[PDB]
Design a protein around this ligand. Structure first.
Ligand code: AKG
Ligand code: MN
Length: 328
């Protein structure tokens, strides 16, 4: 067994299905079968595991070392990693996070135009950049494949999902959780606001998920060599909950935990519409502008951040009513 389950936590140990993703998804009968089997795993368990190739496993090991190095920095070398235009940077709460949003230079056209959330990432040095960025380029390649497989298994119109993620606002949440000695939680029960979540953890362990109802909590054990995938609120909105939005909570174990939360997202300028085929005939009139969706939550979950104060003081929430921030 193992019992790597954090202490004082009642849950069922989960037996997950690992899958091996192609490097190049083409629409072959094998890809369609793999997609439909993965769709079945998300509808029965709410989460599934994907095997890492040796290249993917090495980028993950390089990125896992860089994270321990950042959190090993002094409490003020870390606090100085904040930008006035980007939500990227360090947060300390009882986890600690370093979020990597789209790293855009000061002279980039969308940064010059004061678009909300757009700006350069506050790296301590190029030694955290090369590692985590190369992991995000590999995780991005997996995100596009995972979406193509959902398209083939839900028999969706080709490029129904990959058309929104061209210039996707993919972001990574580099997580470190403390030991148990809130006052007893890492993160409470919550669902992800995005499309897909590719997650990774070390051997300590502490993730719990809630599977989709048939017609209690499940502990996700740390299997080496694999990463987990579960969908978010945007996927549930597009699919009329045919693919779920998995609720999940993180508990503190007897050691410190190091984890990664990758969000494969639509473009900041994407207008996500529901899939009519999966709404029995009547799709809602509601559409979600991802840029507004993202800005509203981050100017909300991080309300006293100087990134949020500058948006209200430069009225950047107005560029969101402009059509150029709504056309990809
Ligand atoms: O906090 C989350 O939403 C994901 C955390 C995670 O990936 C983990 O602890 O394994
Ligand atoms: Mn989450």
């Amino acid at each position: 067994l193992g019992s790597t389950m954090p202490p004082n936590y009642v849950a069922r140990v989960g037996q997950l299905k690992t899958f091996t993703l192609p490097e190049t998804a083409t629409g072959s009968p094998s890809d369609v079968e793999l997609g439909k089997a993965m769709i079945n795993a998300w509808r029965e368990d709410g989460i599934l595991q994907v095997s890492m190739s040796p290249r993917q496993q090495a980028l993950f090991e390089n990125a896992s070392a860089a994270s321990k190095r950042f959190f090993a920095m002094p409490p003020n070398q870390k606090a100085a990693c904040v930008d006035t235009q980007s939500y990227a940077g360090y947060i300390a709460s009882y986890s600690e996070i370093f979020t990597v949003t789209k790293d855009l230079p000061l002279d980039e056209p969308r940064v010059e135009a004061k678009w909300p959330c757009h700006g350069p990432c506050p790296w301590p040095d190029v030694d955290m950049r090369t590692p985590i960025q190369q992991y995000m380029d590999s995780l991005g390649k997996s995100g596009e494949t995972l979406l193509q497989m959902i398209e083939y298994g839900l028999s969706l119109h080709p490029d129904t999902l990959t058309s929104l993620t061209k210039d996707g606002w993919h972001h990574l949440r580099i997580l470190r959780f403390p030991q148990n000695n809130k006052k007893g939680r890492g993160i409470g029960s919550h669902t992800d606001y995005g499309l897909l979540v590719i997650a990774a953890q070390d051997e300590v362990g502490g993730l719990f998920i809630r599977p989709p109802a048939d017609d209690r909590w499940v502990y996700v054990p740390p299997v080496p060599g694999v990463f987990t995938v579960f969908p978010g609120d945007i996927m549930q909105f597009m699919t009329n909950s045919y693919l779920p939005s998995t609720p999940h909570k993180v508990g503190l174990n007897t050691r410190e935990r190091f984890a990664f939360a990758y969000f494969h997202e639509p473009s900041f300028q994407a207008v996500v519409s529901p899939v009519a085929k999966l709404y029995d005939g009547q799709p809602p009139v509601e559409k979600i502008h991802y840029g507004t969706h993202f800005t509203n939550m981050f100017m909300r979950n991080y309300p006293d951040r100087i990134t949020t104060e500058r948006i209200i003081k430069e009225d950047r929430l107005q560029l969101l009513d402009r059509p150029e921030l709504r056309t990809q």
